[PDB]
Amino acid sequence: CPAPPPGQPDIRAIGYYTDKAGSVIDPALQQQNKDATAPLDRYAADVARMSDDYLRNGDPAAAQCTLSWLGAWADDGAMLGQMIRVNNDQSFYMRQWMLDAVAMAYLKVHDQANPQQRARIDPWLQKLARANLAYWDNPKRRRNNHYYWGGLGVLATGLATDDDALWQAGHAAFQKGIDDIQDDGSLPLEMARGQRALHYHDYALAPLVMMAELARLRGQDWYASRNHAIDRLARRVIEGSRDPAWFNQHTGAAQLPLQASGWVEFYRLRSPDGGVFDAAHARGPFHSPRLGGDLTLMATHGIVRTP
């Protein structure tokens, strides 16, 4: 088990879109952001990977090393300080994505946590979750896909730490996202993203799918909400992956090509839909730390090894 890097209480991230539609990447701003957030993304990949190794192998050294890394950053009060604003709220967005990765990683190795590790990690995740919720109480921040990503970490913290209040807030974010699904399966706030509208429909669906998957650990069927409305979005996304024709004729910008993200590994098992997800499934792999790590592995073996 390698030594964890030091936990920084402050986040200093930088947005890299040039335009209003948040779709034209400034490659200078993107590199500046990637360097400034490199240790955060590096930590998220690591706890995702190690918690992957535990679910894959049963190996208790992978669980302990995950818990050791999480406890260290809890002790450091990592990300519990200043969210530095340069040009946008990219720092608040990183705090949502980082809670997502660390909470999901904590959930996957939680059965191996002793009461002393829990007493250190639980309050740290609960403070990040409350801070991520309180970010949205400002009525002038529009609740797009960021809100759905925010909800995933709050829900996983609510479930990991047995906090029913953070669990209900997680559901509230998921329900908001499901209620955004239009007749055509589009999301208005994601349709406004120009050449990345199709990207941001896949990007919005993934945390909704993972939140429905967490509710399934507790035996609830969130997929069924609003007469399976989520199926219209997942269905609209998988067809954009194949043929971007519908999206280009509704957006006023030629879509960049999209390979579906790893929500397909879970969703193909819940609503097979005659095998429309088969092509995406066969063209992985599907690793995203901010969604919990190895989505292929968690889809076939379970998000947790015991309830």
Residue numbers in the entry: 23 to 329
Paper lines:
Unlike other PLs, Smlt1473 present in the clinically relevant Stenotrophomonas maltophilia strain K279a demonstrates a wide range of pH-dependent substrate specificities toward multiple, diverse polysaccharides: hyaluronic acid (pH 5.0), poly-β-D-glucuronic (celluronic) acid (pH 7.0), poly-β-D-mannuronic acid, and poly-α-L-guluronate (pH 9.0). To decode the pH-driven multiple substrate specificities and selectivity in this single enzyme, we present the X-ray structures of Smlt1473 determined at multiple pH values in apo and mannuronate-bound states as well as the tetra-hyaluronate-docked structure. We have built and refined the structures from residues A22-L330; electron density for other residues outside this range was either weak or absent. The structure is composed of 13 α-helical segments (α-1 to α-13) connected by 14 loops (L-1 to L-14) and two β-strands (β-1 and β-2) (Fig. 2, B and C (i and ii)).
In order to visualize and understand the effects of pH on Smlt1473 structure, we have crystallized and determined the protein structure at different pH values (5.0, 5.5, 6.5, 7.0, 8.5, and 9.0). The atomic superposition of all the crystal structures across the entire range of pH values did not show any significant change as a function of pH. However, significant rotameric transitions of important substrate-binding residues such as K42, K162, R163, H221, and R312L have been observed at different pH values. At the entry site, the residues involved in rotameric transition are H221 and R312, of which H221 has an altered orientation in all structures above pH 5.0, whereas R312 has an altered orientation only in the pH 7.0 structure due to a hydrogen bonding interaction with Y225. At the exit site, K42 exhibits an altered orientation only in the pH 6.5 and 9.0 structures, whereas in pH 5.0 and pH 5.5 there is no change in orientation; interestingly, at pH 7.0 and 8.5 a lack of electron density precluded analysis of the residue orientation. For K162, the altered orientation was observed only for the pH 6.5 and 9.0 structures; for pH 7.0 and pH 8.5 a lack of electron density precluded analysis of residue orientation.
